[PDB]
Amino acid sequence: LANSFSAVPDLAYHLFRYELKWVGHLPASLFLHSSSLLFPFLSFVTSSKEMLLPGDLSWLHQVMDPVLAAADSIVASEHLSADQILRETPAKLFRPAG
């Protein structure tokens, strides 16, 4: 509904203020995790099919695709198996890709 009336600047301002007021007694580092409507709001606005304009998809592609293909290259180079990826800490393996 907010995209139909282009009131997304109004909805984003008031969803932020209402969420942060509710979790304001909680500490600052977990304003995003201890809330309930904050993370699903930004996830639907910037990562959904019916919201994201296709020019923004091509930008999200180009910043991420050298990074993800470098992660794929370090899998094939040192022959990391499928279960070795998901049993080992992801930080130890994919350090150059990060």
Binding site: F5, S6, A7, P9, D10
Partner: peptide
């Protein structure tokens, strides 16, 4: 004629300006 109560006016800062033309125009 029961009474009169009050009258309130628009602030300014709290008014909303949502609209598709607020960022785009057509030729």
């Amino acid at each position: 004629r029961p009474a009169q109560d009050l009258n309130t006016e628009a602030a300014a800062s709290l008014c909303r300006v949502f609209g598709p033309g607020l960022e785009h125009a057509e030729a």
